Design a binder for this molecule. Structure first.
Ligand SMILES: O=C(O)[C@H]1CNC[C@@H](O)[C@@H]1O
Ligand SMILES: O=C(O)[C@H]1CNC[C@@H](O)[C@@H]1O
Lengths: 620, 620
């Protein structure tokens, strides 16, 4: 279950395998087996990590349907593999992968946004090793995220009653049709690395929780006492682990030696006096150093954490007992050449833009992001809502056992990967599933999602709030969204309805806010916005102008400011991003307040001024 | 000398000749004179009024050098012409024109921005008449506006030391090289019309002046008494003219009968009790109706006017005795298909944008505008600085008597055309002539311009202030600008110098403002700005971004606000406009706060908010 990010220390070394690999496209539903057994014939270069789709302009890899095959060679000194346990980790392969080393199948994985690994201790040999990775991009009614098996991509146009169209559909080239509004970027989107651990006994997992804070300071910077809990899991085979707690300067401030008991596990609690708390806008990180003891150390791992509590109380969202207000947006992992490929230069820039805007938060719309972004937000004081790739779902998916299992895998896998981050304050178990309607449909949706809500709570040792991000719907027949811990709504009054009429949009919004006012839950926007082409201007801004986007937020935000139970504003989107092509997507989704190259539109400046005057705590 | 705009009434009729004419291009230095004798061979269509340059995409008329020939036919009933004096009026033919009617050369005109007319009574005949107009676009060292005889256009790039460049220049196609930063649009840019007056005696010119205001209300809306004077000139041959003054509702509020004395003139004064004054932001217009008396009326003309005084006093600019502050910009007559062609839809729209912006004024950079725009600003309460086409001048021109004569012609013609407009508060006798330097250059410039300053004063019966718009220069050796009635300066600190460094730009500006503080004259900007491409954005705006343009005005305006003697801010420009092509002009000049299609950039919104808070009177 543990998926600790690979670390190098006195006991452990990481050997990255990123770089320019060999690559070939393959078939709609197969690829040649012999490509795992010998060097790829006539290979193309392909950089990893990165989506493959925008890395070759001679081919139209955006249109590719099915498999591709990556390959590279590598060699490491026998000295450093001798006696060690050898693990090959894929941070992400989107969506499914088969992995081979030296002509041997290592195994496969489904799930394009979470890491997986293989023990290669026995498949490795000295000299050059040949690593082959086949990656499948296909999506459909059984995948998360969901594809459409026929018809159109999400918000695509059709003339389905025209006989010629119906007939041409039967013979059209197979293409993935996302039931979600972002491009289906595929390939080795995140890092690949070989790493070592000791073989006889090793640290497999660590969970740190903030159990209780006694007497939090008025400014929330410290607490008189913090009770933290640790849970260390071991692999391999009267043994002990030493746990040292280091503060922000590396000083040892606490330490215990705990007994390992047979899963081999050690768990306990540690009191940290005068603890320095983690807050939005004021991060503070500790390190838990776990050392497996035999003066010598057998194994070690350093786990960053921050001390803070999260609690929903009535219509408030309390961080360290203080009423928080979210300011931010949904993001995407999306950029020009990389596609969905992780890029830490861009992550660093985006975090600085979050600060420039005076925002404090975002959601990982619509899939878990690369692990390095959460470390960055841990150090930079930015709060995250962590979301699984359960986007595009409807009643067709609720009746499918395979989908339900993939959904539980994604929830368990996201929380197992991300549980130690102090920046994560809430889990989202889906984006815009179908919840409303007549007959049994609302109850069917509820019966599908309630066990997943329970699973997210059971899986997280911090027991953080759980939400489900709700599409614009008939809120009077949806019986699911109102049962979440925080109500997170996506609304486009004045854009997809009441188009351009901000008076009517605000009237409609206020009618629905009157509905939520009586529910007793904290409510926030997780999306709202307007497609905007930079450089389109008007004195009376119409849809797609920079002025209309600014006016849109000015009018809507004035209405939610009147509601004390409305605890956050996350807009859509941080920045323009790529989508499947169609008649409503002008080079992708243009609801960004920043352009795809991260330049600010008029509305970004307006928002920056607004958010500069809204405090993280106590706004409401 | 009078050029009253043609009017239709019981004594007079106007027959417009606009529409789609026939057109041919001709030679660099000649056209076929026989084209006036018969319909043009194989003619192109060409709408009038309009520049010709953008009306044909099969030809490259922007590259044309030399002559073109317009032609059309017309017929009018014998009853219309019988007994009448028939005048053919060209509102503007840019730059020079030869006019033929039924093969007879009527005459020629130089000066591309002011009207001229011919008596055609004897050249007309019954049935179809054939009107042929040859128009010359050429500019050079003796024209106003000034062209360069060799080298490059204004702020063009060159590599003049490369031998191949020097040689190719000798054989390059002839092309006009503007020594001014706007495109040399040519042709019948303004209306053409045939009009009638009585033949025996007729009204030839009217001047109305505001002589004195007694007891002006605190809000300047009225005066207890206003003394106005009239001066009517007659043509033809104990006769009398009735002068009636009509208020805003058409009510005759005053009337006098004057004796015509011989060059036939009638002159006198009228006192208007509780006169409603014309003010920026609060226009009020009277009509002076002059009726030539024999029961019957022989001739009549209705002249609009507004009652207001203009006086420079110390460092203030007094309208109706109140300290005025200019808010506005230089403009251009420039638009997509029309070029420099007059377009009243666009004039109406532009005056509404001036109100939207909360501006109160503009300058007719860099030529007299179409007459209809001044009538519009009369009714809409927008102040005008009226400027002759003396742009591009330096010491080569001051030594040329043909240029001095053309310059005197332009000044007399502008003031004779425009003297009755209340919206005009100041005359500009040149834009950015060479004034500074060493040796005898500063004195030579002074001796050239001082007589023209005196000429503008002698020509205007209202005796309004006279300025010269000064280019960015060494203000310590320029001895001419400081002798103007208002000092009008164009400054581009932080754009063309100290580029992008707004701290240094403001420091430089303050050093020069310290200079003008000691001179003791009222000072205003007539230009300052930054080229800006809509849709270019940055968090720290660099040159060409929307943010830089906004920051430019925010920083510069903060500095002039500290100077009580700085009486106005006219920026460059209202809207992006066309120029000769070159390496610093991205589809023309982009210093507009509006795009060429009149859409607001970020700076326009900022300036609108600034100008909303600055009163027309009493800001300083
Ligand atoms: O339509 C939109 O702009 C948004 C609607 N909510 C879901 C987003 O993925 C999508 O991009
Ligand atoms: O350089 C500029 O942008 C301006 C400088 N002053 C004169 C203007 O005609 C010109 O357009």
């Amino acid at each position: 279950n543990g998926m600790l990010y690979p670390q190098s220390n006195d006991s452990r070394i990481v050997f990255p395998l990123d770089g320019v690999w060999d690559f070939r496209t393959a078939g709609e539903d197969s690829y040649p087996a012999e490509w795992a057994d010998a060097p790829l014939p006539e290979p193309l270069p392909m950089a990893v990590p990165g989506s493959y789709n925008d890395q070759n302009d001679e081919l139209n890899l955006r249109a590719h349907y099915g498999w591709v095959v990556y390959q590279r060679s590598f060699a490491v000194p026998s000295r450093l593999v001798a006696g060690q346990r050898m693990i090959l980790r894929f941070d992400a392969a989107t969506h499914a992968a088969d992995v081979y080393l030296n002509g041997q199948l290592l195994g496969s994985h489904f799930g394009g946004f979470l890491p997986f690994e293989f023990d290669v201790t026995s498949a490795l040999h000295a000299g050059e090793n040949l690593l082959t990775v086949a990656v499948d991009n296909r999506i459909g009614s059984s995948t998360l995220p969901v594809g459409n098996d026929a018809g159109t991509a999400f918000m695509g146009s059709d003339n389905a009653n025209v006989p010629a169209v119906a007939e041409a559909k039967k013979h059209a080239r197979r293409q993935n049709l996302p039931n979600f509004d972002f491009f289906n970027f595929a390939g080795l989107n995140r890092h690949v690395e070989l790493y070592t651990t000791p073989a006889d006994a090793y640290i497999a997992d660590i969970a740190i929780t903030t159990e209780r804070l006694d007497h939090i300071a008025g400014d929330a910077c410290t607490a008189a006492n913090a009770l933290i809990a640790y849970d260390v899991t071991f692999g391999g085979d009267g043994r002990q682990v030493r746990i040292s707690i280091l503060d922000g300067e590396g000083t040892v401030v606490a330490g215990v030696t705990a007994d390992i008991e047979r899963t081999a596990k050690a768990s306990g609690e540690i009191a940290i006096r005068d603890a320095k708390l983690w807050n939005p806008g004021a991060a503070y990180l500790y390190t838990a150093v776990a050392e497996l003891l035999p003066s010598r150390i057998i194994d070690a791992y350093r786990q960053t954490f921050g001390i803070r509590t999260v609690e929903v109380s009535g219509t408030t969202f309390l961080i360290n007992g203080k009423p928080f207000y979210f300011k931010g947006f949904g993001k995407h992992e999306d950029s020009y050449f990389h596609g969905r490929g992780t890029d830490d230069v861009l992550n660093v820039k985006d975090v600085s833009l979050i600060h420039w805007l005076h925002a404090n938060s975002f959601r990982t719309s619509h899939y878990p992001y690369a692990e390095s972004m959460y470390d960055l937000c841990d150090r930079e004081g930015i709060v995250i809502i962590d979301e699984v790739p359960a986007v595009g779902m409807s009643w067709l998916q609720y009746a499918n056992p395979l989908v339900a299992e993939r959904h539980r895998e994604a929830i368990r896998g996201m929380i197992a990967r991300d549980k130690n981050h102090p920046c994560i304050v809430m889990w989202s178990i889906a984006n815009e599933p179908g919840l409303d309607g007549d007959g049994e449909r609302p109850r069917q949706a509820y019966d599908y999602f309630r066990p997943l809500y329970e699973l997210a709570h059971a899986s997280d040792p911090q027991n953080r709030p759980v939400t489900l991000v709700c599409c614009q719907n008939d809120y009077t027949t949806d019986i699911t969204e109102r049962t979440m811990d925080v109500v997170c709504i996506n609304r486009y009054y004045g854009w997809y309805n009441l188009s351009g009429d901000l008076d009517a949009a605000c009237h409609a919004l206020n009618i629905e806010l009157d509905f939520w006012e009586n529910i007793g839950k904290p409510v926030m926007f997780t999306e709202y916005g307007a497609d905007t082409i930079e450089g389109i201007h008007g004195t009376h801004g119409e849809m797609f102008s920079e002025e209309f986007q600014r006016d849109y937020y000015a009018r809507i935000n004035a209405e939610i400011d009147k509601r004390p139970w409305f605890i956050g504003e996350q807009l859509w989107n941080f920045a323009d991003f790529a989508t499947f092509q169609g008649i409503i997507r002008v080079e992708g989704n243009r609801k960004g307040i920043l352009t795809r190259d991260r330049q600010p539109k008029m509305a970004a400046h307006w928002l920056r001024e607004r958010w500069a005057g809204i405090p993280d705590y106590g706004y409401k």
